[PDB]
Amino acid sequence: AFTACEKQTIGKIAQVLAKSPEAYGAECLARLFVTHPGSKSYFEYKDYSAAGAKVQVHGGKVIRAVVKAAEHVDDLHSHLETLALTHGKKLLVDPQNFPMLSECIIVTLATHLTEFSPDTHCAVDKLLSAICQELSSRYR
Amino acid sequence: AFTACEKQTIGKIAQVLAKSPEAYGAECLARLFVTHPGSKSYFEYKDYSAAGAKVQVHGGKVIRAVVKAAEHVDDLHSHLETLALTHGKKLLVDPQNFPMLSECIIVTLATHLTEFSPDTHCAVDKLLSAICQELSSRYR
Amino acid sequence: VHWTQEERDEISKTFQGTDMKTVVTQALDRMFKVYPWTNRYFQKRTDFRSSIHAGIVVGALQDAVKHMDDVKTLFKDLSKKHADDLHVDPGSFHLLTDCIIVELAYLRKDCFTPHIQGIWDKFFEVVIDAISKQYH
Amino acid sequence: VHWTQEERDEISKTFQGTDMKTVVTQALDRMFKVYPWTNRYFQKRTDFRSSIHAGIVVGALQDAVKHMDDVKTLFKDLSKKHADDLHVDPGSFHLLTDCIIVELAYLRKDCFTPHIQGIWDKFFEVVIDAISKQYH
Ligand code: HEM
Ligand code: HEM
Ligand code: HEM
Ligand code: HEM
């Protein structure tokens, strides 16, 4: 589902994210918390901004996972299996939240990347879409 | 991701729908047109009620495809490929509509079926979701 | 939101002539099975009962039906209670109301027409909005 | 909708101090690539130009900002146009506004903070609701 050209772009974005997972992830979550206040209900934090320590720790786990998924595109179903069960069977996070964070990750990259063409935007969106698909596959 | 138990319920429900595809399908579309008016944008009909001749023909095409998908549940991806190419490359129907119609099919089944317990609902909801994901897979 | 007399009547009459407690009880159970993640909030309350909860939910809806033109003001506290106290993901609100519509459909059968479904959809949309308002 | 003093300025100052016609032209091009099905409305319009259409789209938004207190009333005719004459799927409206936000973020880089994004998010929410009102 990923042309050879999309994997190259995905491969470029993953290296930018891997440099500062806490900072990037924290910004992604802060945007999600502002635009969709309902998603805050899963976290018991005192600070919901990107400056929060808890937000940065969680944001770090989230972004590193994306980086790894970008590494395992040829088999996202098998690579993401464990995280899906954790979300679907243990955390029980409403899957409707996944696509909302995807859009916030996209806005975050747009404010940081030097080049974020519609072509690059499309490849990233397709990767985030596939990850959201896998993360909601083991709820029922 | 379909257990043998969900396979029997699905096949049992595909049997019921096959009896009168047009009537069930017409009702499904009428609920969609009432609850999500924006979806009327794809059809140039004068009558958007269950009695409309054009709604009956389309309703029938939709349910027959559902019945056939229920029969090829073991290979949904290769079976719905042609149908997926049609919506994504020719009709260009915004994918956000698929899940909307799935809920109306569920409501339609509840008003007809003698028994529609949470378990049957879940099995049917899982088939429609799988069908919606295949139908949204060839847009970009 | 503006209500027509027909819509007011459909909603008010159903609440006075249908056993909404049973309908909501079955809707909750349906919800826990079709959308398992919603169990999150109750797996912790050891003595939780669908029957009792439904009664508490119907008591609020019954109230919304009486002040249908001011559901936002009426549910202000209930909304704050769900956001700050219970921490219920507002995205889950429609999962319950959607299940109530399935139960109403299953109960009224061919009498639950697309038009009638539209009235209930509209009503639940107003209720979801009112109860999701105080989420900051 | 009640707009704080902070939001009113953020929105108006931008339409004032920024080249919004270029932002929406790129937003349109971005939407056509990321969400390919939105191209269907222009596949038969032989003389279509992204930059021309954008000036027209920005025109309505500028008018919405001038009347930020009652966009709903202002957009009534425009909404009927999209619903009855143009037959545009209302569920596609946010695909363009979402792309406008991506262009604003790419433009303001680190100045497009989560809080600032929330302002624009609420604004386009009000605009999408106003342009979708007359779909019956
Ligand atoms: C779409 C991208 C997402 C990815 C890749 C992702 C990734 C992760 C990872 C790697 C963990 C830690 C796994 C572990 O330690 O076992 C985690 C934890 C968690 N996730 Fe997700 N997640 C995503 C979206 C979401 C969303 C949108 C929410 C809700 C708004 C959410 C809520 C949680 C919660 C509550 C935890 C537990 C954190 C804790 O208790 O410390 N996740 N996620
Ligand atoms: C359960 C999901 C759906 C199924 C199984 C389905 C199935 C079909 C089938 C079998 C056809 C006939 C294709 C052909 O002529 O070769 C079709 C056509 C079409 N579908 Fe879908 N469809 C679904 C959802 C939707 C939705 C939600 C919309 C939009 C609101 C939509 C809009 C259309 C349109 C515009 C056509 C063309 C109608 C015509 O040729 O007169 N479909 N669909
Ligand atoms: C949309 C319709 C809903 C209405 C009108 C509603 C109404 C109520 C009311 C009136 C209460 C009692 C308030 C109090 O304790 O003082 C309550 C409690 C609660 N609600 Fe909601 N609610 C709704 C949906 C939901 C949903 C979908 C969930 C989550 C899946 C939820 C979870 C809870 C929980 C966890 C409690 C407290 C449980 C307990 O104390 O036994 N509610 N709700
Ligand atoms: C919410 C943002 C939008 C605004 C403010 C907006 C505004 C406008 C305006 C002012 C017109 C002119 C109406 C007239 O003829 O007097 C128009 C035309 C049109 N709009 Fe929208 N629109 C928006 C989004 C969309 C979207 C997302 C699509 C579809 C992808 C769309 C498709 C069209 C089409 C097809 C025309 C006709 C243009 C032509 O004839 O070349 N609009 N819109």
- Helix (H), strand (E), coil (C) string for chain B: CCCHHHHHHHHHHHHHHHHCHHHHHHHHHHHHHHHCHHHHHHCCCCCCCCCCHHHHHHHHHHHHHHHHHHHCHHHHHHHCHHHHHHHHHHHCCCHHHHHHHHHHHHHHHHHHCCCCCHHHHHHHHHHHHHHHHHHCCCCC
The three-class DSSP label of residue A36 is coil
By Cβ distance, the residue of B35, B50, B118 closest to C34 is B118
The Cα D121–Cα D124 span in angstroms is 5
User: What would the two tokens of residue D85 be?
Assistant: 């004459």
Is the CB of residue B58 less than 8 Å from the CB of residue B23? no
Tell me the residues of chain D between 27 and 46 that have a Cβ less than 8 Å away from chain A.
29-30, 32-34
Helices in C1-135 by DSSP H: which ranges? Answer: 5-17, 20-34, 50-66, 71-74, 76-80, 93-108, 114-132
Domain residues for the domain of A82 are: 1-140
> Between helices A98-112 and A21-35, what is the axis angle to 10°?
120
Q: For residue D81, give the ligand 4 atom closest to its CA.
A: 13
The Cα A115–Cα B90 span in angstroms is 31
- Looking at the structure of chain B, the number of domains it has is 1
Q: Do D89 and B41 touch (CB under 8 A)?
A: yes
Query: Which residues of D make up each annotated binding site?
Result: 53, 82
By Cβ distance, the residue of A88, A92, A97 closest to C39 is A92
**CA–CA distances in Å: residue C99 to residues B57, B63, B106, B116, D121:** 29, 22, 10, 12, 30
Is the CB of residue B67 less than 8 Å from the CB of residue B17? yes
> Between helices C20-34 and B118-135, what is the axis angle to 10°?
50
Q: For residue A80, give the ligand 1 atom closest to its CA.
A: 5
Read off the CATH number of the domain in which A1 is found: 1.10.490.10
User: What would the two tokens of residue D41 be?
Assistant: 């409305």
Contact residues on chain A for D34, CB-CB shorter than 8 A: 118, 121-122, 125
The Cα B69–Cα C93 span in angstroms is 31
**Residue of chain A whose alpha carbon sits nearest to that of C40:** A92
The Cα A94–Cα A91 span in angstroms is 9
CB atoms under 10 Å from CB of B127, counted, come to: 24
The experimental method behind these coordinates is X-ray
Q: How far apart are the first and last CA of chain D?
A: 23
Contact residues on chain C for A136, CB-CB shorter than 8 A: none
> Is A87 annotated to bind ligand?
yes
**CA–CA distances in Å: residue B41 to residues A103, A117, B93, D27:** 26, 31, 10, 23
User: What would the two tokens of residue D60 be?
Assistant: 């309505």
Is the CB of residue B116 less than 8 Å from the CB of residue B110? yes
The Cα B63–Cα B67 span in angstroms is 6
Q: Do A118 and D30 touch (CB under 8 A)?
A: yes
Asked whether D and C share 3 or more beta-carbon pairs under 8 angstroms, the answer is no
Residue nearest to atom 8 of ligand 3 (CA): C57
> What's chain D's Rg over C-alpha atoms?
15
Q: How many CB pairs under 8 A join A and D?
A: 51
CA C53 to ligand 3 centroid distance, Å: 7
**Would you give the DSSP letter of residue C86?**
I
Residue nearest to atom 3 of ligand 1 (CA): A62
Whether chain A has a CB inside 8 Å of the CB on D20: the answer is no
**CA–CA distances in Å: residue A130 to residues A99, C59, C76, D2:** 10, 42, 38, 38
The Cα C26–Cα C106 span in angstroms is 11
CA A62 to ligand 1 centroid distance, Å: 6
> Between helices B21-35 and C114-132, what is the axis angle to 10°?
40
Q: What is the resolution of this structure in A?
A: 2.0
Is the CB of residue A131 less than 8 Å from the CB of residue A76? yes
Domains detected in chain C: 1-136 (1.10.490.10)
A14 pocket-lining for ligand 1 (C-beta < 6 Å): no
CA D86 to ligand 4 centroid distance, Å: 8
The Cα C131–Cα B37 span in angstroms is 24
Query: Which residues of D make up each annotated binding site for heme b?
Result: 53, 82
> Is C2 annotated to bind ligand?
no
Please report where in the chains the tokens 């959201």 appear, as a residue.
A132
